[PDB]
Amino acid sequence: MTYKLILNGKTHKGELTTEAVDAATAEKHFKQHANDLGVDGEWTYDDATKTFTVTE
Ligand SMILES: [Mg+2]
């Protein structure tokens, strides 16, 4: 399924998507992307919209 990440960081803003079998797997994909960008914040997940948010 397609999951989304809302980047709501100090310098990085925007949204990324990933393809994943489940929410836990998507979270791993998004953590890798976030780490790549140096984004380091508070994570939440909403299953109704399959959307993660990371806020710095
Ligand atoms: Mg499970």
Curated annotation (Swiss-Prot):
Sequence repeats: 2-56
Location of this chain's protein in the cell: Secreted, Cell wall
Protein name in UniProt: Immunoglobulin G-binding protein G
Record organism: Streptococcus sp. group G
Encoding gene per record: spg
